Ligand SMILES: O=P(O)(O)O[C@H]1[C@H](OP(=O)(O)O)[C@H](OP(=O)(O)O)[C@@H](OP(=O)(O)O)[C@H](OP(=O)(O)O)[C@H]1OP(=O)(O)O
Ligand SMILES: Nc1ncnc2c1ncn2[C@@H]1O[C@H](COP(=O)(O)OP(=O)(O)O)[C@@H](O)[C@H]1O
Ligand SMILES: [Mg+2]
Ligand SMILES: [Mg+2]
């Protein structure tokens with residue numbers, strides 16, 4: 387026998403940084419995959435928060451809003467919040483099967499700064515302009531790298547795949563009930579130069595439940611990936627934009643990708659991509675994962691056009707939008723909470739993403755499994771995982787900014803359609 391320190395919360399010192407590599411990133415988090423050898427972190431990624439350079443856990447109204455869970459609102463810092471929110475809110479609605487909720491790790495302000503320097507190269511100019519890494523969390527989250535187990539993993543950020551029916555949408559905003567917000571949004575994204583090409587994808591095809599509308603969706607995506615489609619080869623990008631959105635696939639990158647699916651997809655040159663896509667579509671349609679998700683999203687029972695009102699009650703500030711419908715203000719404050727919390731929850735579900743791993747059975751290391759795909763026209767069997775990512779809680783305050791963003795979306799669409 388020998389004597390060792392008692393147990394202690396691991397801490398990531400200013401030396402472990404060179405173990406991590408740039409993965410991707412959103413508006414809210416950094417993500418780096420693991421390159422070092424320590425068994426603990428192998429097959430893991432670190433999700434490190436950043437700070438918009440114009441910047442306690444929960445505001446007073448957010449405490450009351452999420453109060454139905456004492457452990458949640460009493461979160462020290464945002465990693466526990468992130469943990470408890472997936473743990474006691476999301477998985478109840480979503481099921482633990484396709485979420486792999488996260489583990490905290492302490493980190494030194496020095497470690498962060500080291501990662502911050504190490505990625506800036508791989509990061510997109512305007513992401514560097516808009517946010518460095520937030521070097522005053524003590525913590526960060528470690529997750530299973532949902533592109534591992536050759537392993538081909540594809541990521542789909544579906545967005546909201548239903549159309550509202552609220553009695554509070556106005557005649558003028560009548561389009562909102564027949565055009566997905568995603569399509570209209572695209573117009574506003576084009577005017578602001580954030581894409582080059584209106585995207586072929588319509589999340590209605592994905593959330594339709596038609597094994598045939600879904601393949602169109604997956605076909606659309608590969609065509610115009612923007613920032614909703616990504617395909618990896620063992621932790622590397624091969625289709626999609628890294629940390630950002632990317633222009634329509636071209637003849638040159640489709641012929642590059644194509645010659646990449648070599649030896650994973652077994653089909654003659656110029657046939658693998660149409661195969662790979664059938665595979666993705668069938669993983670998505672077969673796993674049924676996309677269904678329960680669209681149930682969460684539909685906790686938007688009133689659309690932001692009606693929900694904003696309940697928001698102004700919550701924060702007990704007189705309602706701007708009204709102009710002298712009591713109906714929504716005459717609610718008991720308790721009911722007005724439920725709509726806004728269910729709104730926020732729904733927001734988590736429209737902004738989340740799906741990762742799908744693959745292990746071809748044409749490789750001898752094949753650990754079979756009851757979730758798999760048999761791709762009829764090449765005779766290959768593929769075992770696959772489907773997991774969620776970016777189930778972050780959203781701030782009560784984005785409500786106001788949500789309403790404004792909606793207004794501009796349906797105002798601007800109405801516009802370009804009046805032209806004709
Ligand atoms: O950058 P991404 O990783 O893609 O995600 C960003 C936002 O996430 P946050 O980082 O939490 O803000 C996301 O959710 P929000 O927080 O706004 O609810 C937005 O969705 P929407 O605004 O609701 O439509 C995104 O817009 P679309 O991707 O076009 O949906 C995008 O905004 P950006 O372009 O300014 O970064
Ligand atoms: N657990 C994970 N496994 C593999 N890739 C991930 C994981 N988490 C995030 N990523 C990748 O890094 C990106 C970071 O985004 P995300 O974690 O959703 O934070 P944000 O709030 O910034 O959108 C994702 O779009 C995803 O492709
Ligand atoms: Mg994201
Ligand atoms: Mg997020």
Ligand SMILES: [Zn+2]
Pocket residue numbers: 695705706707708711715
């Ligand atoms: Zn009102």
